[PDB]
Design a binder for these strands. Structure first.
Lengths: 150, 91, 229, 125, 200, 25, 102, 101
RNA sequence: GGGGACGGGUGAAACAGGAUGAUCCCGCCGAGACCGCCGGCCGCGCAGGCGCCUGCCAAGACCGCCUCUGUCAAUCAAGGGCGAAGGCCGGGGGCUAGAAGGCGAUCAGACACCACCGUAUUCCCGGCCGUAAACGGUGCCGCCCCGCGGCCGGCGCGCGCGUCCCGCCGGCCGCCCAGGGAAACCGGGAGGCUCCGGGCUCUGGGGGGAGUAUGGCCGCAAGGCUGAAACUUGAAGGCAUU
């Protein structure tokens, strides 16, 4: 179930059993990688670029066609985001919750949400540091979070 | 550090004299007066209280009227909003 | 009308009865008689009856159509005492209490909106309207409950019908529109597209503010029978 | 000669009062309590029956051939049921020959009411 | 020196001559050096502006209100004290206002007032704490401190006077028509003592 | 509520006992 | 509304990452006069004399000037800098500024 | 033990509910516990309704019917016989006795 | 303004209100609470809790998904936050209800219940408190789990087609077959357990003494949290039957 919520919901994408380029596929692996870089230049978060390739184009799974996941392709060209996107999205959510709370000190429920989002940021950050994706130097500073977004 | 354990932090000067209630009220009132509030125009927290009712930005050099121990009193802040909403309605 | 003609009790030993007449739009103009103490030091009787408020049923106001709108009532306040006859202007309307109660039911959603409207004249009035949801014909479930999207859309809809109906019209036009029930009807047609609805009626309309000396407004309201328009 | 009779029913006493349509001037007033010496009998319909009979003579003298009926209980935070004398009030007027015009509830019902006497435990009688 | 409220020197042009007149105004909270202020029937609605009381919308907090028009300042001119505009009678040209005591007075709509609540608000909240901060406080004002209780004074100095024990010896409440030297106790006291629920 | 009334008596005795302790402190 | 607000935030971030930007009035006026500026973004807190002067030089160079919400600190947070930034000039943009005239 | 599995309160997924009042007791009862009946009845006594209607000068004026809701507390209802103490088997039935009037 | 003898209250009463015209009616104003009927085997929320209008601001579960990441998870001493009510401490405000307090009936007494008046409080704002039969008297994550019904949300399939039919997922519920239990009853578990072992925290070990003494900490206090022993005793308790 959800770490900070009591919901037991299971909405999960299930990838196809046969990992193959679509029968209707007409594009090379490099062609997809060159397209991916253009969206990376646009700055689109990696989850979004996968959605765009699936909906705007028709590559259902990048691994099936290119042979690599989108983040691995970004890392190869050095077009990877410095913070793994998953941490960035929580950090951005925490920044907004902090801003709303600064206007209202009476929103006790909002403070509750801030503790959980910040706790998730700290938990995920430790994993990234251990993996070496992020530096041992990384520490979460609420004060520097907005600056960290850039 | 932690030279004074309790809220005697700004009230250490008064010593044993004056009673706890007095000092407790002073601990809140004097902490705010001494503190540097943000400048509305400077955008720096360099506003300090020159005199009761007078707070001056140390960067812009602008002098702004305000409450005695706080740059913005809550009743004035409410009226500022009420006047803005009433003006925009009368517009 | 008894004391002016002959003997009645100690208070009504010196009292008068004055005819009260309602606006031109209504089929039976006469409302009734008003008891009033005779002229005194400063208490001139006509000045005493200048601002008395009568509560008339639409069935009494427009008889021969009682079965429809028997519930709807109109509060009317005298503005002039000319001809010895009180001339009244519309000051409020409300549906009867017996009907208000019959409007609510379990397993229904009630939408009440209040919208103050500045009229094309001087008067400022708040239109209180009510609507209820009703079971769709198939209805596998037993509850006429709708999702928020229908609730918001329907309430947005109610404001819009008033916006293009009672939003910019003068008080005599409003009296005809609330009497023929025209504006109540418009909300239902708009609501009918939005959802299955019942009881979409303007329940109350109150005079929030009155332009002073609406004597000219009382000429049009009372004697402009020729300008029925 | 239309007029309106407001009939407080409530409990404790019954008030039968006929007035002008405006309500500004009272043609007549009577109370169930005036008729009965015992305090408990004041809301009872027998006291009320004698009471509206007395009012009929006064009101019919002052014209008032026809009356409209508005009937209210204590209302507000109390009862909301007319209680005892209310049923008699229309009946005695019908015996008198006053003609009914329209009947209505004048209960002062409260949207979002103020607190009522009794406490959370209630009247522990 | 005397006022616990800041005063502001606002310089307006001189219509009569070529000079720039300097006027001392009570400074409503938020007034800033450099703020432009407009005065008149057509004046705008920002904190600081002085406009006829009728013009100001109902609910605004207004300071230095005029009891009668062209009195150049009369009510709500102390720290954090505001007057609320309650209503505007169009027929009588009279505007009701709630003074900082709560009492309501009707003022000609022609009278002028400044938009805003006076600064130095919340000053009373701070305890004076020492006798010295009181001495320094009334040096600026009149010689009205230290105060000797009358029951400490000898019989000849105060009506409360002195006996073998310090007691007033008679009801503190004194008649409204007490002669100049007699009015020393609580005067015209409708009620006395701490009761509570006094809102009635 | 005898349990409630018993804890009120204990709380009263505990107030008096602490106050008496203070007099001889 | 906030869908657009995200686009302004993403343009500012991507300009900071790739593209040439100038922080501050002295740099802004120097670039606007020489026409190096492509877009001018000004904080609401900017002094009301500075606002009217930049507005005129911007009219002369036909360079669009927009107000960024309010407070130089807020512009600063969007440029990723703790110091306050009253005027930010976009000389070149890594993410095309369709919101050049937002 | 648990006399009622509903614990005497139609409270599900709620934690706390609004408060209501016994009409006669004026007691405070949770809304879930309150008996809650809806009664629609004639404004005039039904015995006098026909005569009043005939006397009513208005053509086709239906007698107004009062619409009100009466809520009582458990203690209040048992004394007023709004609901009756029932046998352990009879408690499980949830259907109105003898088939809202 | 009206009209003229009672009115309140009750189980009956009595006290306080009435010719200074009450009650009652009608307009009018002020003040503060409070969201009625719709309103629930409705829902949301981490619990405590949550219902006027128009906005404004950040959220949250769920579903749908060939989106991204790649064990980032679970339960949790210490530590942090939240926590109904009443209480407190500074500021407001003040209708109503109303601990105290006063009265009026009752009774042997009544000083209690019922009436009448009424302060703290209730309401707001900044703190403190840290407790409730805070209960669903059932910790949390995980799996299996027998059918039958309702309800809420999201989605899908099918057809006349309608807020239809059938599912799926997440909830909120009722009835139960097995099983279980000392039973009452649980059965979406209190089942899969004397044929006893998924993981992890908390607490209990006959009844009093006693949540007392004392020591610590915390609190402005009220008190909270921790917490005995000496000694006494053969019972205390649960659920059912008569």
């Amino acid at each position: 179930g959800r770490m900070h919520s009591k919901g037991k919901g299971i909405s999960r994408s299930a990838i196809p059993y046969t990992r193959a380029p679509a029968p209707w596929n007409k594009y090379t692996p490099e062609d997809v990688c060159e397209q991916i870089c253009k969206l990376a230049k646009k700055g689109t978060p990696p989850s979004r670029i996968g959605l765009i390739l699936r909906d705007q184009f028709a590559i259902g799974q990048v691994k099936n066609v290119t042979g690599s996941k989108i983040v691995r392709i970004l890392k190869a060209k050095g077009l990877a985001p410095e913070i793994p996107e998953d941490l960035y999205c929580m950090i951005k959510k925490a920044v907004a919750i902090r801003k709303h709370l600064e206007r209202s000190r009476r929103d006790k429920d909002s403070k509750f949400r801030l503790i959980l989002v910040e706790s998730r940021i700290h938990r995920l950050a430790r994993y990234y540091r251990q993996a070496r994706r992020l530096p041992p130097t990384f520490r979460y500073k609420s004060d520097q979070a907005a600056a960290l977004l850039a | 550090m932690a030279k004074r354990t309790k809220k005697v932090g700004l009230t250490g000067k008064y010593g044993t004299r004056y009673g706890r209630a007095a000092r407790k009220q002073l601990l809140k009132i004097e902490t705010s007066q001494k503190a540097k509030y943000t400048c509305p125009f400077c955008a720096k927290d360099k506003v300090r209280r020159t005199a009761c009712g007078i707070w001056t930005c140390r960067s812009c050099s602008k002098t702004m009227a305000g409450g005695a121990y706080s740059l913005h009193t809550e009743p004035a802040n409410a009226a500022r909003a009420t006047i803005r909403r009433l003006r925009l309605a009368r517009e | 009308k008894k004391i002016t003609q002959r003997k009645n009790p100690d208070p009504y030993l010196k009292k008068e009865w004055y005819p009260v007449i309602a606006p031109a739009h209504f089929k039976s103009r006469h409302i009734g008689q008003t008891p009033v103490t005779k002229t005194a030091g400063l208490r001139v009787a006509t000045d005493v009856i200048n601002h008395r408020v009568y509560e008339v049923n639409l069935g009494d106001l427009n008889p021969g159509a009682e079965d429809l709108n028997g519930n709807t009532k109109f509060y009317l306040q005298t503005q002039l005492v000319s001809d010895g006859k009180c001339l009244t202007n519309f000051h409020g309307m409300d549906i009867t209490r017996h009907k208000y109660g019959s409007l609510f039911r379990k397993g229904c959603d009630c939408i009440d909106v209040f919208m103050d409207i500045p009229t094309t004249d001087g008067y400022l009035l708040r239109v209180f309207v009510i609507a209820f949801t009703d079971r769709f014909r198939f209805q596998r479930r037993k509850n006429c409950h709708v999702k928020g999207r229908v609730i918001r859309m329907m309430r947005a809809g109610i404001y819009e019908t008033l916006h293009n109906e009672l939003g910019k019209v003068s008080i005599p036009v409003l009296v005809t529109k609330l009497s023929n029930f025209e504006v109540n009807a418009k909300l239902t047609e708009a609501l009918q597209k939005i959802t299955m609805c019942r009881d979409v009626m303007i329940r109350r309309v109150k005079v929030v503010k009155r332009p002073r000396n609406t004597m000219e407004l009382l000429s049009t309201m009372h004697d402009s029978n020729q300008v029925r328009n | 000669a239309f007029a309106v009779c407001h009939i407080y029913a409530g409990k404790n006493d019954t008030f039968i009062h006929v007035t002008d349509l405006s309500g500004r001037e009272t043609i007549g007033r009577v109370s169930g309590g005036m008729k009965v010496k015992r305090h408990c009998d004041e809301p009872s319909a027998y006291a009320a029956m004698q009471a509206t009979q007395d009012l009929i003579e006064i009101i019919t003298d002052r014209g008032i051939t026809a009356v409209h009926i508005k009937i209210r209980a204590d209302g507000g935070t109390g009862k909301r049921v007319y209680g005892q004398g209310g049923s008699a009030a229309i009946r005695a007027l019908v015996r008198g020959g006053i003609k009914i015009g329209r009947i209505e509830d004048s209960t002062p019902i409260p949207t979002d009411r103020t607190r009522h006497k009794g406490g959370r435990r209630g009247r522990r009688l | 020196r005397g006022r616990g409220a800041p005063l502001a020197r606002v310089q307006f042009p001189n219509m009569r001559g070529e000079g720039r007149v300097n006027e001392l105004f009570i400074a409503p909270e938020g007034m800033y050096t450099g703020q432009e202020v407009f005065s008149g029937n057509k004046a705008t609605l920002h904190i600081g502006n002085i406009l006829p009381v009728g013009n100001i919308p109902e609910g605004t907090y207004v300071c230095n209100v005029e009891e009668k028009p062209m009195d150049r300042g009369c009510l709500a001119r102390a720290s954090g004290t505001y007057c609320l505009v309650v209503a505007h009678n169009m027929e009588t040209n009279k505007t009701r206002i709630r003074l900082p005591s709560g009492q309501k007075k009707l003022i000609s709509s022609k009278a002028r007032a400044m938009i805003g609540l006076v600064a130095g608000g919340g000053r009373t909240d701070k305890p004076l704490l020492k006798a010295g901060n009181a001495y320094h406080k009334y040096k600026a004002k009149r010689n009205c401190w230290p105060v000797v209780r009358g029951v400490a004074m000898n019989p000849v100095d105060h009506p409360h006077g002195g006996g073998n024990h310090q007691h007033i010896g008679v009801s503190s409440c004194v008649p409204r028509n007490a002669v100049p030297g007699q009015k020393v106790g609580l005067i015209a006291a409708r009620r006395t003592g701490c009761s509570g629920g006094k809102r009635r | 509520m005898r349990a409630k009334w018993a804890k009120k008596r204990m709380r009263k005795l505990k107030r008096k006992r602490r106050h008496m302790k203070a007099r001889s402190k | 509304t906030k869908k657009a607000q995200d686009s302004i935030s993403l343009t500012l971030t991507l300009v900071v990452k790739s593209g040439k930007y100038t922080l501050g009035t002295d740099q802004a006026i120097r670039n606007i006069r020489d026409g190096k500026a492509q877009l001018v973004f000004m904080a609401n807190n900017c002094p009301p004399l500075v606002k009217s002067q930049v507005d005129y030089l911007c009219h002369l160079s036909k360079t669009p000037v927009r107000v960024f919400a309010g407070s130089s600190r807020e512009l600063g947070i969007a440029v990723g800098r703790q110091f306050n930034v009253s005027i930010m000039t976009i000389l070149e943009a890594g993410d095309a500024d369709l919101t050049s005239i937002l | 033990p648990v006399k009622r599995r509903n614990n005497g309160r139609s409270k599900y997924n709620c934690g706390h509910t609004n408060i209501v009042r016994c009409q006669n007791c004026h007691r405070c009862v949770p809304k879930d516990k309150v008996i809650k009946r809806f009664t629609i009845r004639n404004i005039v006594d039904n015995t006098i309704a026909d005569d009043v209607l005939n006397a009513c000068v208005i053509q086709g004026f239906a007698i107004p019917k009062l619409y009100n809701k009466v809520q009582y507390c458990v203690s209040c209802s048992i004394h007023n016989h709004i609901v009756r103490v029932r046998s352990r088997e009879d408690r499980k039935i949830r259907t109105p006795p003898k088939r809202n009037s």
